[PDB]
């Protein structure tokens, strides 16, 4: 009976397919570790897959995975329990230490490039022909923190050239320097651009970019991690919704 044979063979195929799929999804994060960085006893029923090599464009080398590439950098955390499964509380300022929801990864310290070899992200003033085509143009607007105080002013939009979209807002602070704010972490209103994740006092703390004309993947991660980490670590300074309504 073909039908019985077919449904029987399908279940055998599916089992192997899930097995194959699961192993392909272990090319990052494995082998597992004990909370102290040592390899765990039980790695589960699925085995590491045979390595694969990505030939990276723009002569940026290759990437073999899974690979021994370790954690490396220091983490400002300390376990709060003797057994496993418990939180590890920060020993310093989580925001400034880049841990917890404020975490970042040591990505390549070079800008992401578009298919043509050029810097993927650029400040609009240096992006030939680029302009705001719809919606409120944020440039020139003051920036308000979650504490309802003025953190600075928008002096430019950082544009993703190929994807032809806005990625960051360049906000100038009191001291005259600027910082990059993730576009999806700001709210562009008709008279302000509000940033709920951070309070005016946390802006100077946003990680900086070494060069004023580009951002490296490493810097994007620190900036983004830092800003997101404010949802939790800047909660004390986050005034309420009614308070915001009260300030028109």
């Amino acid at each position: 009976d073909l039908a019985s044979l077919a449904i029987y063979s399908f279940w055998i195929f599916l089992a192997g397919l899930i097995y194959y799929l699961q192993t392909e999804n272990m090319r990052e994060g494995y082998p597992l570790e004990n909370e102290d960085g040592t390899p765990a006893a039980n790695q589960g029923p699925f085995p590491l897959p045979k390595p694969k090599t990505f030939i990276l464009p723009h002569g940026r080398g290759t990437l073999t995975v899974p690979g021994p590439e370790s954690e490396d950098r220091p983490i400002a955390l300390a376990r709060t329990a003797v057994s496993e499964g418990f939180p590890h509380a920060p020993t310093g300022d989580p925001m400034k230490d880049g841990v917890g929801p404020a975490s970042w990864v040591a990505r390549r310290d070079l800008p992401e490039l578009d298919g043509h070899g050029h810097n993927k992200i650029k400040p609009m003033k240096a992006a030939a022909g680029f302009h705001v085509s719809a919606g409120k143009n944020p440039i020139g607007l003051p920036v308000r923190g979650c504490d309802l105080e003025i953190a600075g002013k928008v002096v430019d939009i950082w544009v993703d050239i190929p994807e032809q979209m806005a990625r960051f807002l360049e906000v100038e602070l009191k001291d005259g320097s600027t910082r990059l704010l993730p576009m999806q972490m700001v709210k562009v209103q008709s008279n302000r651009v509000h940033v709920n994740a951070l309070s005016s006092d946390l802006f100077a703390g946003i990680p900086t970019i070494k060069s004023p004309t580009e951002v490296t993947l490493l810097e994007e991660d620190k900036i983004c991690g830092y800003v997101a980490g404010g949802l939790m670590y800047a909660a004390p300074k986050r005034k309420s919704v009614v308070a915001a309504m009260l300030a028109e």
Partner: protein, 280 residues
């Protein structure tokens, strides 16, 4: 155990209830207050179903089936044997799902990410509630809900459908299906595109987003973009479930006959209703 890059994220906080009380992990799973609640509701429902099986006379998965109260009970309670168990399991299901969702919100907070996932899941929960809570209530009888059986629930889908002829004619139903088909189409497309770039022709360098964009641009004359293809996927999936719930909430509440007859409003429209020819 943890993923080689996990430790730095396992910090305190994010909880909505109970503070640090249940703020810990069991292996890979994060618990939190709602993780506990999920277990509770889940266990209670599985136990009550297993209990319904005893009273039924089987442990055969393909035969076990917990039915809702008969139409005789309207929206009132019923003996654990004639609808009660169902009622309480339906309660445990709703309590497990909702808790599961609230459990994802706490995880989002500890990870510092958006709440899109649980928000998306809630659409699944609402479609479920439409079938076992909303529609039954609007029709005033728990008995209109679907039975909890691997096979008995298809009987319900089948009998519920034919009550109005060929269900294909339910207009909201056509829309739901369209989003379901379109979404699978889009899922296969997205998966294939990202893969075709990361895994190019042997020996060459992995392609770039510009290649993904040009491939699709050459193929159909448009590229929705990386951010847009993910919004599309979420949009297509949630819309499929939104219209699924809609097509049911109106069946047996504001519409009662053969769905096919509903298309008459267009055929009998005054101006062309009697023009000779065609099919009508």
């Amino acid at each position: 155990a943890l993923l080689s890059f996990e430790r730095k994220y396992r910090v305190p906080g994010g909880t909505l209830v109970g503070g640090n009380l249940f703020d810990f992990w069991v292996g890979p799973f994060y618990v939190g207050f709602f993780g506990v609640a999920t277990f509770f509701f889940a266990a209670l429902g599985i136990i009550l179903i297993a209990w319904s099986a005893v009273l039924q006379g089987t442990w055969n998965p393909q035969l076990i089936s917990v039915y809702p109260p008969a139409l005789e009970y309207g929206l009132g309670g019923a003996p654990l044997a004639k609808g009660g168990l169902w009622q309480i399991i339906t309660i445990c299901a709703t309590g497990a799902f909702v808790s599961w969702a609230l459990r994802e919100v706490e995880i989002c907070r500890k990870l510092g990410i958006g709440y899109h996932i649980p928000f998306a899941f809630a659409f699944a929960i609402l479609a479920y509630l439409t079938l076992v809570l909303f529609r039954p209530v609007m029709m005033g009888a728990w008995g209109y809900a679907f039975p909890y059986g691997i096979w008995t629930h298809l009987d319900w889908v089948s009998n519920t459908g034919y009550t109005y002829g060929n269900f294909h004619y339910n207009p909201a139903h056509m829309i739901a299906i369209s989003f379901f088909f379109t979404n699978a189409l889009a899922l296969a497309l997205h998966g294939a595109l990202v893969l075709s770039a990361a895994n190019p022709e042997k020996g060459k360098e992995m392609r770039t987003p510009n290649h993904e964009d040009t491939f699709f641009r050459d193929l159909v004359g448009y590229s929705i973009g990386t951010l847009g293809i993910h919004r599309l996927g979420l949009l297509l999936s949630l819309s499929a479930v939104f219209f699924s719930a809609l097509c049911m909430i109106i069946t047996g509440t504001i519409w009662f006959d053969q769905w096919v007859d509903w298309w008459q409003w267009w055929v009998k429209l005054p101006w062309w209703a009697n023009i000779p020819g065609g099919i009508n």
